[PDB]
């Protein structure tokens, strides 16, 4: 369903964190890992465009009542909540051969 709705940008967060556990296991069937790699790469490009639209919508979330570091810490947390997801997805793909499969799926 997520490979069907890859242009369907409304995506639940459950389907990716459940398929990452399908990537992490080794005794499963190899055909499930293709769709697991597809939903993982879809969440990766969704996190990338979420980071781009967070960086583009910069001056709406800034409050002048704070200091120069509190707004910086808030923006750093808002960016790290997308960066750690990509750091988890690529670390899950590191322990399998599906990280090569998303390379051919993207190209």
């Amino acid at each position: 369903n997520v490979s069907h709705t890859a242009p369907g940008v409304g995506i639940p967060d459950e389907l990716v964190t459940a398929a990452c556990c399908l990537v992490d296991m080794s005794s499963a069937s190899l055909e499930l890992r293709k769709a697991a790699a597809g939903v993982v790469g879809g969440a990766i490009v969704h996190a990338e465009e979420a980071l781009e639209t967070l960086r583009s919508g910069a001056p709406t979330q800034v409050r002048p009542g704070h200091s120069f570091d509190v707004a910086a810490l808030a923006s750093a947390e808002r960016e790290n909540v997308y960066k750690n997801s990509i750091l988890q997805y690529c670390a899950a793909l590191q322990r399998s051969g599906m990280s090569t499969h998303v390379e051919e799926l993207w190209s």
Partner: peptide, 27 residues
């Protein structure tokens, strides 16, 4: 349009500034 650019994972990791050794040792 940058259609000849690589669409692998490595440029995404270098945009975030991480190597694959850091991703093997993070969790």
């Amino acid at each position: 349009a940058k259609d000849t650019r690589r669409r692998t994972l490595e440029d995404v990791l270098k945009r975030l500034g991480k190597t694959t050794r850091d991703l093997g040792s993070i969790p």
